[PDB]
Symmetry: D2
Subunit: 21 residues, 4 copies
């Protein structure tokens, strides 16, 4: 799930975890 | 849009901006 | 915020609203 | 990744796929 060079998939997974402490 | 005291809405909006840069 | 002709931004905003109902 | 009864994780995964046809 990439937007050009950005790995949106990865950043979103990190956010989900960060918000579910 | 928060999960507990985590500002998920905001962080997601920041990801959409970064991904779009 | 689109992936090709898919309006991802919009659909995501709709998910945030539904999840918050 | 739940918001009350809503499975945000699941809906978001479906959206990612839908936008990556």
């Amino acid at each position: 799930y990439r937007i050009x060079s950005y790995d949106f998939x990865d950043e979103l997974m990190k956010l989900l975890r960060q918000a579910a402490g």
